[model samples]
Target: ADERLQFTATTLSGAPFDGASLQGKPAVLWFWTPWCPFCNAEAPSLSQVAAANPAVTFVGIATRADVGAMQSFVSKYNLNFTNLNDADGVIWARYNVPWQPAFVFYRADGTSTFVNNPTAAMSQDELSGRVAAL
Candidate 1:
């Protein structure tokens, strides 16, 4: 069985990051869809979040990327975190997520908080405060 802590998808590198790999660490799931306006606008902040919080595992799940285009998408936006694929909505199906640019923060205990809406771009302190819960 997969030992990874969170529900992980196949990454751009083609390896499945087991949830177990995320054990003992806090994490972010940036559930973004390709061509989503808000997600496009929010790319820089996600990049900044990864840069500012090196200790936290910040992963970007491109919930609707074409399997072949993840590299392009990651490159175009300069994404620095672990980028994943949800091309078939398999991941979104598990979480029942109906929107893009959402977040799910997982604690070290395997519990997580899903911030499924965004009224504004989050600052690093806000990001840090959320991650610190783990």
Candidate 2:
């Protein structure tokens, strides 16, 4: 697991999520805005990627959105992964993503790469390519 996921945080469900969540697996932190049309449009692709890659942990980072909005977004997209609340934007700042829909892939050994303003609608191949670094 990447040390980045080591930070203490409350998930949208109010349960704890930290380094233990990744549990030695490589992970993906998907940064998104609750109301971005681009984000809204591409959710299914993310959902697909998440469903297909159970070995690679997928975590959603909601930037500037309340839990309700983030929950709604997750429901609207049929996303099965867990989402973290970044209502205050600390995680966003740490990732250096000024735009919504960014993707950060962390290898199990903790190496990582980030992409900002990605394929508003990502394809499985596109997402898989990003993880190839892992």
Candidate 3:
């Protein structure tokens, strides 16, 4: 497992987001921010992929945002996935990520193949392939 993904954070819905919990299951880490237009634009497609892949774990980190804003964004976008609020960017630091709308597809063992720009129009198959390959 990558040391980065092992960091602990709290979900927007007030649950523990222990990245280690993802061990033995392929996971998708979506790093986003409530105020980012790119993240906003990609939410629908992300939600669709999440819905289609119920077996694969999807963990979202709402970077650099307040809990209330993260919750509102999740509700407004109809995002059904569980998401963490990384208000101080600690999650970003752990991942060493430079920007928003970043999608990291992780293997069951936690190695990642990054998808830098996820868009609203991405197909379910496309998203699933990324997850499956992980």
The lDDT leader among the candidates is 3
In candidate 2, how many Å is residue 57 off?
0.2
- What TM-score does each of the candidates earn? 0.79, 0.86, 0.86
The 10 consecutive residues of candidate 1 with the worst lDDT sum are 1-10
Candidate 1 lDDT, 50-108, residue by residue in tens:
77777888877776557667677777878887887767877776667787878888776
Q: Model 1 TM-score?
A: 0.79
Which parts of model 3 are misplaced by more than 4 Å?
A: 118-125
Tens digits of lDDT, candidate 3, 1-134: 46666778888888877777887778888888889887887787788878877888888888776788889889987889779888788777777778888887878776778767644534557776786666
User: How big is the positional error of residue 121 in model 3, measured in Å on the Cα after superposition?
Assistant: 7.3
Predicted model with the maximum TM-score: 3
lDDT of each: 0.72, 0.78, 0.79
User: Where is the poorest 10-residue window by lDDT in model 3?
Assistant: 115-124
lDDT of 2 at 55: 80
Candidate 2's C-alpha runs over 4 A off are 118-120
Tell me, what's the RMSD of every candidate?
3.1, 2.2, 2.3
lDDT for predicted candidate 2 compared with the true structure = 0.78
Clashes of 2: 0
Report the number of clashing residue pairs per model.
6, 0, 0
